[PDB]
Enzyme design. Structure first.
Site, PDB file in Angstrom:
ATOM      1  N   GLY A  18       0.773  -1.224   0.000  1.00  0.00           N
ATOM      2  CA  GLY A  18       0.000   0.000   0.000  1.00  0.00           C
ATOM      3  C   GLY A  18       0.806   1.277   0.000  1.00  0.00           C
ATOM      4  N   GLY A  20       2.384   2.369  -2.783  1.00  0.00           N
ATOM      5  CA  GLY A  20       2.335   2.915  -4.125  1.00  0.00           C
ATOM      6  C   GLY A  20       3.243   2.205  -5.107  1.00  0.00           C
ATOM      7  N   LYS A  21       3.497   0.915  -4.879  1.00  0.00           N
ATOM      8  CA  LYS A  21       4.347   0.169  -5.799  1.00  0.00           C
ATOM      9  C   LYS A  21       3.712   0.073  -7.181  1.00  0.00           C
ATOM     10  CE  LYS A  21       4.650  -3.598  -3.383  1.00  0.00           C
ATOM     11  NZ  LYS A  21       3.386  -3.023  -2.858  1.00  0.00           N
ATOM     12  N   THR A  22       2.414  -0.231  -7.241  1.00  0.00           N
ATOM     13  CA  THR A  22       1.751  -0.374  -8.534  1.00  0.00           C
ATOM     14  C   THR A  22       1.733   0.945  -9.295  1.00  0.00           C
ATOM     15  OG1 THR A  22       0.349  -2.078  -7.532  1.00  0.00           O
ATOM     16  CG2 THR A  22      -0.309  -1.221  -9.687  1.00  0.00           C
ATOM     17  N   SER A  23       1.447   2.049  -8.605  1.00  0.00           N
ATOM     18  CA  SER A  23       1.385   3.341  -9.279  1.00  0.00           C
ATOM     19  C   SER A  23       2.738   3.713  -9.872  1.00  0.00           C
ATOM     20  CB  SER A  23       0.912   4.417  -8.303  1.00  0.00           C
ATOM     21  OG  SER A  23      -0.412   4.159  -7.873  1.00  0.00           O
ATOM     22  N   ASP A  45      -0.712  -8.232  -7.982  1.00  0.00           N
ATOM     23  CA  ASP A  45      -1.948  -8.332  -7.216  1.00  0.00           C
ATOM     24  C   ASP A  45      -3.105  -8.613  -8.166  1.00  0.00           C
ATOM     25  OD1 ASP A  45      -4.156  -8.134  -5.617  1.00  0.00           O
ATOM     26  OD2 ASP A  45      -3.801  -6.068  -4.974  1.00  0.00           O
ATOM     27  N   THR A 470      -5.348  -1.233  -0.538  1.00  0.00           N
ATOM     28  CA  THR A 470      -4.533  -2.425  -0.338  1.00  0.00           C
ATOM     29  C   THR A 470      -4.521  -2.866   1.122  1.00  0.00           C
ATOM     30  OG1 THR A 470      -3.141  -1.536  -2.101  1.00  0.00           O
ATOM     31  CG2 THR A 470      -2.364  -3.510  -0.956  1.00  0.00           C
TER      32      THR A 470
END
Ligand code: ADP
Ligand code: ADP
Ligand code: MG
Ligand code: MG
Length: 552
Positions: A18, A20-23, A45, A470
């Site tokens: 949560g 901000g890895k995906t962003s 994920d 997340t």
């Protein structure tokens, strides 16, 4: 930024869930695609909604994104891989082996460790692939293997024979050893990999990422990067005291970073007000009266059903210790006896209050020392029989979070037993996996019987969660695991709700709206009784200020 310069083929990310890895991964992929080089973003994920942001449906099959030329997307579903492992390792034995063996196999091949092993298996499958790594110059994963997994996989030793150890998921690794050896060598080579750490600008998250960096450096990775994501702009705190306090804490965290992480190149990402939900939002990334029940209702309920344990549980860095201290102090204020057994040696929350309050007590359990003691105790049991390689493999396994949680739970068991007609607030409950495994295996350290924990009348496992997507999803996963273990969490505690606090600025207002959505979801289909704790402007490290949490 400093981490997108002449980048190698592969590029991983890792950090607290949560942050901000995906962003950041999506933004880097978009920027590299705009540069001119073909990339292959690989989300991890399953519910990431990565396909939503790009505008196309993404699955196990590689699919180009028409919007951004020379961009390919892919998805890895670790839960699906774990279920496949369980199905193809249990079906052959189902209906022919005793129910105890089936239960043990099911439990061992389930939980967080199995998902991590499956994720690394899929990562290795993507790596050293026939044409996947030959047609696309760049691959940008969204979550990297933990140090424990990397250490386990490269270790040799027979894996065709899988008491609380977590060597079960390694038994389902079908591919040849050479495959994983080559995968790990490619991962550790600085020429091919550039692992990037993403961590919020907070003390707890910074220390956690420092520990992960120390592990990864021990593995062999040489060059890394740091991307501090979540810095609140200073000008945003013009006329909001809460914003000023947030900025002050963030700046203090930046000023005093752990020594180990100082040498690494560092980056800063401002908290862009625009919500990161569309393509335009991610393109520029790298360049109200809330009235919900407070902790008063939870305290009143606990007060009504006394002589019970109040054992919090939740992923690290969500304020479990502070909430436990607040609950214990509030109960002590009413005159009822409490035993606040926190496990945070770094800081003291109820210090100097033990003597002031007649009935309050405390027991400070150091997780590191307990883990070391448990490791030493178990090394000489089942170690002599094993050959040197087996002993090394077991020692490597015993560094997993499962071993640490088991050690902490065992240390807590004696405190539980020594407390009778008296409240006992905990700090970190074991997850469902640990409880089920320790109950199945057991049928100086001794653990509390699962009978007491499963009893609704003596074990109220509160679940503390941060107010974001997340964290909520992983807390729901933990709740599902606990329900599988047979214990029903009594309530939920959403923590750090800016909406609950007085926010009168743009960015804080948007964050409050998002956290309001999360709170609504939690109240709708996650918990039958929830309590919201606001983001206290003053750090709750005293004794009289803790009441602020319990009486906003
Ligand atoms: N730099 C940023 N600015 C604004 N919002 C951010 C930033 N980084 C992350 N977020 C917010 O965090 C939320 C979830 O982040 P996510 O990408 O899920 O992190 P993780 O993949 O680690 O869970 C997103 O909805 C996004 O709006
Ligand atoms: N309700 C809250 N409001 C503001 N800050 C909080 C709150 N709860 C926790 N924190 C902050 O979060 C930090 C880390 O939380 P901590 O309780 O150490 O996590 P853990 O339970 O994993 O130890 C603490 O330094 C504390 O100041
Ligand atoms: Mg993510
Ligand atoms: Mg803690």
């Amino acid at each position: 930024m400093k981490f997108l310069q002449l980048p190698p083929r592969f590029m991983f990310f890792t950090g607290k869930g949560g942050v901000g890895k995906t962003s950041i991964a999506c933004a880097t992929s978009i920027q590299l695609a705009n540069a001119g080089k073909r990339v292959l973003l690989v989300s991890t994920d399953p519910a990431s909604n990565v396909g939503q942001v790009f505008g196309v449906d993404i699955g196990n099959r590689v699919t180009p994104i028409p919007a951004v030329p020379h961009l390919s997307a892919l998805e890895i579903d670790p839960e699906a891989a774990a279920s496949a492992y369980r199905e193809r390792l249990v079906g052959p034995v189902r209906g022919v082996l005793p129910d105890d063996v089936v239960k043990g196999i099911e439990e061992s091949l389930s939980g967080a460790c199995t998902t991590e092993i499956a994720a690394f298996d899929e990562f290795t499958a993507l790596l050293t692939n026939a044409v996947l790594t030959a047609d696309y110059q760049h691959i940008i994963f969204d979550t990297a293997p933990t140090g424990h997994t990397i250490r386990l996989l490269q270790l040799p030793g027979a894996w065709s024979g899988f008491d609380a150890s977590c060597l079960g998921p390694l038994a389902g690794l079908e591919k040849q050893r050479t495959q994983y050896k080559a995968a790990v060598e490619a991962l550790a080579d600085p020429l091919q990999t550039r692992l990037v750490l993403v961590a919020r600008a907070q003390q707890a998250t910074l220390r956690e990422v420092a520990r992960t960096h120390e592990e990864l450096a021990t593995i062999g990775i040489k060059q890394q990067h740091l991307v501090i994501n979540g810095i609140l702009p200073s000008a945003e705190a013009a006329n909001d005291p809460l914003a000023a306090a947030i900025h002050e804490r963030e700046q203090t965290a930046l000023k005093n970073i752990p020594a180990t992480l100082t040498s690494l190149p560092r980056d800063l990402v401002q908290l862009k007000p625009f919500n990161l939900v569309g393509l335009d939002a991610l393109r520029q990334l790298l360049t109200i009266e809330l009235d919900e029940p407070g902790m008063g209702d939870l305290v009143d309920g606990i007060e009504a059903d006394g002589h019970g344990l109040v054992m919090l549980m939740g992923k690290g860095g969500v304020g479990k210790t502070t909430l436990a201290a607040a609950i214990a102090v509030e109960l002590a204020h009413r005159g009822l006896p409490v035993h606040l057994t926190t496990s945070d040696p770094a800081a003291h929350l109820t210090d100097t209050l033990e003597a002031s309050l007649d009935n309050l007590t405390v027991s400070r359990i150091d997780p590191h020392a307990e883990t070391e003691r448990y490791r030493q105790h178990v090394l000489e049991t089942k170690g002599a029989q094993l050959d040197a390689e087996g002993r090394a493999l077991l020692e490597e396994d015993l560094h997993s979070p499962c071993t640490e949680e088991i050690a902490v739970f065992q240390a807590f068991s004696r405190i539980i037993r020594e407390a009778g007609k008296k409240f006992v607030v905990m700090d970190t409950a074991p997850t469902g996996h640990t409880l089920l495994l320790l109950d199945a295996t057991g049928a100086t350290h001794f653990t509390t019987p699962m009978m007491q924990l499963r009893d609704p009348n003596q074990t109220k496992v509160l679940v503390v969660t941060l107010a974001e997507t997340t964290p909520v999803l992983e807390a729901a996963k933990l709740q599902a695991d606990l329900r599988r273990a047979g214990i029903e969490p009594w309530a939920w505690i959403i923590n750090t709700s800016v909406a609950a606090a007085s926010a009168k600025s743009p960015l804080l207002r948007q964050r409050a709206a998002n956290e309001l959505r999360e709170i609504n979801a939690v109240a709708n289909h996650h918990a039958d009784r929830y309590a919201v704790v606001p983001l206290l402007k003053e750090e709750p490290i005293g004794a009289e200020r803790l009441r602020a949490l319990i009486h906003p």
